[PDB]
């Protein structure tokens, strides 16, 4: 999907600015979809809505993971100097991939551990 997949970009301050500018164009839509599905679940508890809620949650997680991986591979060495506070905060927020840095087996074990503790 073009929306969930970032395009080619440049590893410079101007490239970072274009990265942040393009970040809205997909993040707005993805977050609106996910949070709207969650709101529909929380207002109409019917058994249909939970499937949409979980599908949108997975979609948002994958979008964030892909964008964060691209931002990492493009700006990790140059994550210090930007001469722009707002773009620095944006890049720091996107770069933090979190639990996606684990391999497949370890990521599955981690998600299973969280779910099992909750249960
Ligand atoms: C997450 O939880 C499941 C379910 O078991 C529950 O959690 C355990 C940690 C204990 O507190 C249980 O009392 C509780 O019911 C765990 O699966 C359990 O482990 C065994 C050995 O793995 C399961 O047999 C197989 O295990 C794997 C998947 O784990 C697959 O090959 C099979 O699908 C099959 O489930 C066993 O079925 C299951 N026990 C019960 C009573 O259902 C699971 O291991 C755990 N995951 C992690 C990462 O801790
Ligand atoms: C953050 O990203 C969003 C998405 O690109 C940017 O906001 C968007 O801004 C445009 C106008 O600049 C909005 O268009 C307007 O939308 C509605 C359509 O019903 C209506 O008010 C007008 O007819 C007009 O077309 C647009 O809605 C809006 N958001 C989205 C999600 O499309 C915003 O500029 C970005 N902020 C940054 C980069 O700082
Ligand atoms: C990004 O660059 C790679 C370089 O291999 C290319 O394959 C890919 O098509 C590019 N993506 C876009 C969306 O242009």
From Swiss-Prot:
Disease note: Ischemic stroke: A stroke is an acute neurologic event leading to death of neural tissue of the brain and resulting in loss of motor, sensory and/or cognitive function. Ischemic strokes, resulting from vascular occlusion, is considered to be a highly complex disease consisting of a group of heterogeneous disorders with multiple genetic and environmental risk factors.
Glycosylation (residues): 8, 24, 44, 81, 116
Similarity remark: Belongs to the peptidase M2 family.
Oligomeric form and interacting partners: Monomer and homodimer; homodimerizes following binding to an inhibitor. Interacts with calmodulin (CALM1, CALM2 or CALM3); interaction takes place in the cytoplasmic region and regulates phosphorylation and proteolytic cleavage.
Domain of life per record: Eukaryota
Protein name listed in UniProt: Angiotensin-converting enzyme
Note: Inhibitors of ACE are commonly used to treat hypertension and some types of renal and cardiac dysfunction.
UniProt modification remark: Phosphorylated on tyrosine residues on its extracellular part, promoting cleavage by secretase enzymes and formation of the soluble form (Angiotensin-converting enzyme, soluble form).
Task of the protein: Dipeptidyl carboxypeptidase that removes dipeptides from the C-terminus of a variety of circulating hormones, such as angiotensin I, bradykinin or enkephalins, thereby playing a key role in the regulation of blood pressure, electrolyte homeostasis or synaptic plasticity. Composed of two similar catalytic domains, each possessing a functional active site, with different selectivity for substrates.
Induction per the UniProt record: Up-regulated in failing heart.
Record localization: Cell membrane; Cytoplasm
Tissue and organ distribution: Ubiquitously expressed, with highest levels in lung, kidney, heart, gastrointestinal system and prostate.
Organism: Homo sapiens (Human)
């Amino acid at each position: 999907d073009p929306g969930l997949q970032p395009g080619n970009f440049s590893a410079d301050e101007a490239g970072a600015q274009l990265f942040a500018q393009s970040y809205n164009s997909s993040a707005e839509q993805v977050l609106f979809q996910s949070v709207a599905a969650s709101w529909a679940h929380d207002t109409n508890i019917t058994a249909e809505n939970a499937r949409r809620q979980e599908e949108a949650a997975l979609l948002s997680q994958e979008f964030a993971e892909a964008w964060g991986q691209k931002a990492k591979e493009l700006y990790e060495p140059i994550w210090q100097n930007f001469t722009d506070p707002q773009l620095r905060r944006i890049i720091g927020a996107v770069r933090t991939l979190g639990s996606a840095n684990l391999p497949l087996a370890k990521r599955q074990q981690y998600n299973a551990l969280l779910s099992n503790m909750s249960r």
